[PDB]
Amino acid sequence: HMEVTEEDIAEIVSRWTGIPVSKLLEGELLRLEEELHKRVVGQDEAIRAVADAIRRARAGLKDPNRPIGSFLFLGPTGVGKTELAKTLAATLFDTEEAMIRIDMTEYMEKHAVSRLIGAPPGGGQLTEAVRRRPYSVILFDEIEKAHPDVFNILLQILDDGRLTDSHGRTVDFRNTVIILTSNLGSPLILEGLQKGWPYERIRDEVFKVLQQHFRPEFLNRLDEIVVFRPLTKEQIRQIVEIQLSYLRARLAEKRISLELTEAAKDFLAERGYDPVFGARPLRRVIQRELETPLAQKILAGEVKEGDRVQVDVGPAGLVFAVP
Numbered sequence: 001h002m003e004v005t006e007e008d009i010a011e012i013v014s015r016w017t018g019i020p021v022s023k024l025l026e027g028e029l030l031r032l033e034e035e036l037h038k039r040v041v042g043q044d045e046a047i048r049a050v051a052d053a054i055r056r057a058r059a060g061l062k063d064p065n066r067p068i069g070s071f072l073f074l075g076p077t078g079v080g081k082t083e084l085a086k087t088l089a090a091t092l093f094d095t096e097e098a099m100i101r102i103d104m105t106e107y108m109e110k111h112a113v114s115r116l117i118g119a120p121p122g123g124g125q126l127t128e129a130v131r132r133r134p135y136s137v138i139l140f141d142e143i144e145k146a147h148p149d150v151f152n153i154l155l156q157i158l159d160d161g162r163l164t165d166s167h168g169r170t171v172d173f174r175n176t177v178i179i180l181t182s183n184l185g186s187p188l189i190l191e192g193l194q195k196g197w198p199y200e201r202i203r204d205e206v207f208k209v210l211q212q213h214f215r216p217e218f219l220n221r222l223d224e225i226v227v228f229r230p231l232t233k234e235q236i237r238q239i240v241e242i243q244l245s246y247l248r249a250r251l252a253e254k255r256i257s258l259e260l261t262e263a264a265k266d267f268l269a270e271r272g273y274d275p276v277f278g279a280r281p282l283r284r285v286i287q288r289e290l291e292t293p294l295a296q297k298i299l300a301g302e303v304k305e306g307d308r309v310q311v312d313v314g315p316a317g318l319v320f321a322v323p
């Protein structure tokens with residue numbers, strides 16, 4: 001039957017049950033890694049770890065009273081942790097609105113548990129969010145900064161697959177994916193390399209800090225611990241291309257094409273990435289170095305509807321030409 005699609009029936013069931021369409025159609029998942037890789041460049045280990053856990057859950061091999069998966073993402077800033085969490089949410093649960101982000105720097109000071117689960121009688125940021133979206137990816141950023149009382153609430157999620165809030169009502173976490181992140185150790189490695197420390201010192205100091213913050217009792221609860229890697233030159237270039245996608249689409253409305261030389265791509269990659277911030281700088285590098293001067297060319301009439309635009313490097317920055 002052709003006229004009524006799989007999506008038609010899935011949408012009916014989804015609206016009646018609250019189960020996301022992609023969840024209902026999970027089986028009609030074996031290429032989850034390739035789907036995640038459409039947005040997340042590299043970090044193959046993280047993608048495989050997440051995909052492996054989801055498969056074990058779908059195959060009926062895990063404890064049904066725990067979340068679908070739980071992970072600790074270690075490694076540096078700006079290399080794909082949040083991008084993977086956002087992409088996973090969009091892929092598993094149809095929208096990035098299915099990602100719930102808890103910034104643990106806002107939960108450091110003792111009375112923060114009431115912020116998480118609701119003030120005691122006489123609601124909570126986490127509990128209310130998960131009640132209204134049981135099918136969600138939950139991202140806890142910078143977990144080592146959480147107050148112990150807040151950290152104990154995370155342990156409850158991992159152990160019981162549920163939380164009781166301050167109203168006394170149980171909040172179901174069994175359909176969530178829990179992603180915990182920390183950059184712990186990464187600034188220390190940068191400090192050692194700047195100071196000229198030998199690798200042995202750097203290594204030993206990273207392990208003692210990890211030992212201090214992350215104990216086996218905690219870590220044993222997790223599906224996997226994954227250390228994100230710094231990005232290679234080729235990976236940063238692929239990220240530049242992904243980050244030009246929306247610009248190209250907007251330009252294509254006026255039939256304008258952009259053709260970047262390899263040097264122009266390398267210009268953006270060089271400025272858009274560093275060890276401290278990862279690829280966090282790239283968006284505003286593209287805005288400043290490409291979009292702004294392109295805007296001036298369009299407004300001046302030098303770049304017109306229908307033009308193919310060559311983008312190359314000059315010593316003042318990127319330069320433009322229409323052949």
Ligand SMILES: Nc1ncnc2c1ncn2[C@@H]1O[C@H](COP(=O)(O)OP(=O)(O)CP(=O)(O)O)[C@@H](O)[C@H]1O
Nearest residue numbers: 039040041042077078079080081082083239279280
């Ligand atoms: N592996 C990757 N694949 C695709 N894009 C990536 C990427 N790593 C970084 N980016 C780009 O750089 C930005 C920053 O990456 P991301 O948000 O994943 O880092 P992060 O989780 O460390 C952010 P924060 O420092 O705020 O916690 C993303 O919005 C994305 O555009």
